[PDB]
């Protein structure tokens, strides 16, 4: 009378039907419910993502250390998002943002709202506000962990002392999930780390993507390589990797990204110190090859084109 795989698909499809489709799912499934994603700026980590960019109506959490390359792509998300004619919001509770790097990422800065909030509650208040609106396709948080609390802004004492902080990002984000759905705004939380932050604790359970953001390399000094792992995904095979170069000045350098995944994808051949496309010569050195790829616009087009056709 018992069958596995007819019993398993049973359940599966009653686990996904009581919670939702993501509940539960084979890792290596393969991904056609193609969703509407905003990329993310860097062709390997869509990928990663299963569906090519971060989903939309969704709560993103992108944690990792400093300078390790969160802030770049939450930017890049912002002005792919805009230049599909849609608007953005920040929410910065840090005053880091640099608008002249954003512009350089391709955001429409003039068009972006900015707001900096006094306090935790009235930051993530500010942001509700804005997304229930329904004119958001993306709004970013800098700084989970700058989202402290009033009673601790202000004055307030040694007593009661709390974790009042994670409670607060959790109302919060009890009631901004479902706006963020109906609405269809990303929301990203710029988590940096140095519970993960306090209020990563509720982040944890209400994210539908987690990005792992770290710093690995550094490419003279240019720029820095970044790895991410997609530590959580809702809405495909979790676990996955991605990594692309971010020199300075720049933001995720397009070129390089080709140079790493058509080598792994064999669609330019790399003997040892010598990257070759289809017999072309393309330089000694992934900057040599960067540099070509950059000059002779044309190839690598081609080679966007037959890695994204073997692809998606
Ligand atoms: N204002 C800038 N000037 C020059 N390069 C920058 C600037 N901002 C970002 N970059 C580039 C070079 C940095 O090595 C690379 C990584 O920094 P960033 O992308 O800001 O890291 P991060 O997102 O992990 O920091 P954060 O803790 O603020 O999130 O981005």
């Known amino acids: 009378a018992p069958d596995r795989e007819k019993a398993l698909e049973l359940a599966?499809?009653?686990?996904?039907k009581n919670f939702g489709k993501g509940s539960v799912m084979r890792l290596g499934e393969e991904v056609r419910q193609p969703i509407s994603v905003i990329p993310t700026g860097s062709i390997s980590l869509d990928v990663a993502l299963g569906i090519?960019?971060?989903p939309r109506g969704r709560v993103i959490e992108i944690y990792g250390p400093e300078s390790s390359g969160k802030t770049t792509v939450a930017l890049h998300a912002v002005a792919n998002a805009q230049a599909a004619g849609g608007i953005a919001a920040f929410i910065d509770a840090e005053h880091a943002l640099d608008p002249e790097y954003a512009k350089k990422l391709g955001v429409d800065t003039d068009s972006l709202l900015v707001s900096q909030p006094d306090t935790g509650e009235q930051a993530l208040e500010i942001a509700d506000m804005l997304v229930r609106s329904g004119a958001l396709d993306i709004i970013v948080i800098d700084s989970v962990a700058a989202l402290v609390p009033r009673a601790e802004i202000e004055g307030?004492?040694?007593?009661?002392?709390?974790?009042?902080?994670?409670?607060?990002?959790?109302?919060a984000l009890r009631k901004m999930t479902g706006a963020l759905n109906n609405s269809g705004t990303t929301a990203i939380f710029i988590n940096n780390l140095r519970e993960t932050t306090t209020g990563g604790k509720a982040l944890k359970?209400?994210?539908?993507?987690?990005?792992d953001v770290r710093?690995?390399?550094?490419?003279?000094?240019?720029?820095?390589?970044?790895?991410?792992?997609?530590?959580?995904?809702?809405?495909?095979?979790?676990?996955?990797?991605?990594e692309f170069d971010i020199l300075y000045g720049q933001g995720i350098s397009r070129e390089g990204s080709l140079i790493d995944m058509g080598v792994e994808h064999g669609f330019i051949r790399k003997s040892g110190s010598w990257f070759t496309y289809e017999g072309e010569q393309l330089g000694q050195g992934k900057e040599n090859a960067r540099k070509f790829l950059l000059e002779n616009t044309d190839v690598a087009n081609e080679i966007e084109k037959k890695i994204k056709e073997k692809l998606g």
Do not use: C, W
């Open 52 to 54: 090519g960019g971060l």
């Open 205 to 211: 359970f209400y994210a539908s993507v987690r990005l």
């Open 215 to 242: 710093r690995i390399e550094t490419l003279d000094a240019v720029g820095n390589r970044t790895r991410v792992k997609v530590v959580k995904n809702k809405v495909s095979p979790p676990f996955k990797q991605a």
């Open 12 to 16: 599966m499809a009653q686990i996904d």
């Open 156 to 171: 307030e004492m040694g007593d009661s002392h709390v974790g009042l902080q994670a409670r607060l990002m959790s109302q």
